C-alpha cells in the first residue's frame, strides 16, 4: 500500500521545538521536556510522568507510525517504561505509563519493570480498552494483553525504533532493537487480528518512573496515512 506522510501528527528534530518551548501540533504535559532533537518524556528522576499527544485528531482508516526512542539508565534494571497510543481521548495526565486510564483505543507498552515477578521483562505489550477497563499496573497488564513479545529496549548503542501498523483490522508491531544503524532492520514482535479502534483519535506518547527511573527520550514520531 501507498504511504502518505502526515506532518500534523508527527514530530522530529533537528528543530523539534518552537522558540516558545512548544512542539508544533502536539500538546505536552507532566514532566516531559521538548528540546531541539528529542523529547525527554520522563526524566531519570523519582515518580515522574509525562506525555505528548496530538492536538487535532486524525481520520485515517489504516495507518503506520514509526517511533524512535532511547530508554537509558545506570542499572541493568530500570523503570518504568514507555507507551505509544492511539485513542479517542487525549490521555495527558494519568497512572498509565504517565497517561490517563479508561482509554478508548489501543496502547503499546514498553515495560522496563517486572512488576508481577515473572522474570518476563523488559517487554512490549498491546492492550485494548473500550472506555471502561483499568490497566493492571502491578500485573504488567498480562491478562489484558491482546498480544505481546519480549525485547530488551534499554541501553542500546543506536536508538530503538518501533513500527506500528494498522492495516485492515490488524495492528502490527515490528521493532528494531538499536543494535544496527539500519533504521529499517526491523524484526517481528507481535500482531492483533480483527481489531477495531476509533474512526478518529489522537496519537500519543508517554512515560513514567517511580522507585526506579530512566530517561525516556523520543527522537521522532512519524505518522502515515496508508
Amino acid at each position: 500500500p501507498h504511504r502518505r506522510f502526515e506532518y500534523k501528527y508527527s514530530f522530529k528534530g533537528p528543530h523539534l521545538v518552537q522558540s516558545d518551548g512548544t512542539v508544533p501540533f502536539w500538546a505536552h504535559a507532566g514532566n516531559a521536556i521538548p528540546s531541539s532533537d528529542q523529547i525527554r518524556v520522563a526524566p531519570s528522576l523519582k515518580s515522574q510522568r509525562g506525555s505528548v499527544w496530538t492536538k487535532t485528531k486524525a481520520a485515517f482508516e489504516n495507518w503506520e507510525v514509526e517511533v524512535t526512542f532511547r530508554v537509558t539508565g545506570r542499572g541493568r534494571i530500570g523503570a518504568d517504561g514507555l507507551a505509544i497510543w492511539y485513542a479517542e481521548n487525549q490521555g495527558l495526565e494519568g497512572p498509565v505509563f504517565g497517561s490517563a486510564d479508561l482509554w478508548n483505543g489501543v496502547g503499546i507498552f514498553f515495560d522496563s519493570f517486572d512488576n508481577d515477578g515473572k522474570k518476563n521483562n523488559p517487554a512490549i505489550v498491546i492492550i485494548g480498552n473500550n472506555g471502561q477497563i483499568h490497566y493492571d499496573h502491578q500485573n504488567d497488564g498480562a491478562s489484558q494483553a491482546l498480544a505481546s513479545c519480549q525485547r530488551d529496549f534499554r541501553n542500546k548503542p543506536y536508538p530503538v525504533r518501533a513500527k506500528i501498523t494498522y492495516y485492515q483490522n490488524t495492528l502490527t508491531v515490528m521493532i528494531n532493537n538499536g543494535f544496527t544503524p539500519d533504521k529499517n532492520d526491523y524484526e517481528f514482535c507481535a500482531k492483533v487480528e480483527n481489531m477495531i479502534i476509533p474512526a478518529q483519535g489522537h496519537f500519543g506518547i508517554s512515560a513514567a518512573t517511580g522507585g526506579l527511573a530512566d530517561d525516556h527520550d523520543v527522537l521522532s514520531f512519524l505518522t502515515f496515512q496508508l
Binding site: 500534523k8 514530530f11 528534530g13 508544533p24
Partner: protein, 58 residues
C-alpha cells in the same frame, strides 16, 4: 535554486515535508497549518505528503 530546495532538507532525503516546511515558515498554529496545507495541495502532485525537486521547481 537547488540550494533552496535543500536549505531545509534537514534529514537529507531530497524531499521536503510538512515539518521541514514548518521551520522555514517559523505565529498561530492554525495559520501555520494553513500555509503548509496550501503548499501541499499546490505542489504535491502524488499525495505521498512530500515534495521532490520536480514538484518544488514546477
Amino acid at each position: 535554486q537547488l540550494h533552496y530546495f535543500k536549505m531545509h532538507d534537514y534529514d537529507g532525503n531530497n524531499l521536503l515535508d510538512g515539518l521541514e516546511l514548518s521551520t522555514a515558515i517559523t505565529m498561530s498554529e492554525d495559520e501555520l497549518i494553513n500555509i503548509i496545507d496550501g503548499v501541499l495541495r499546490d505542489d504535491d502532485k502524488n499525495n505521498d505528503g512530500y515534495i521532490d525537486y520536480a514538484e518544488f521547481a514546477k
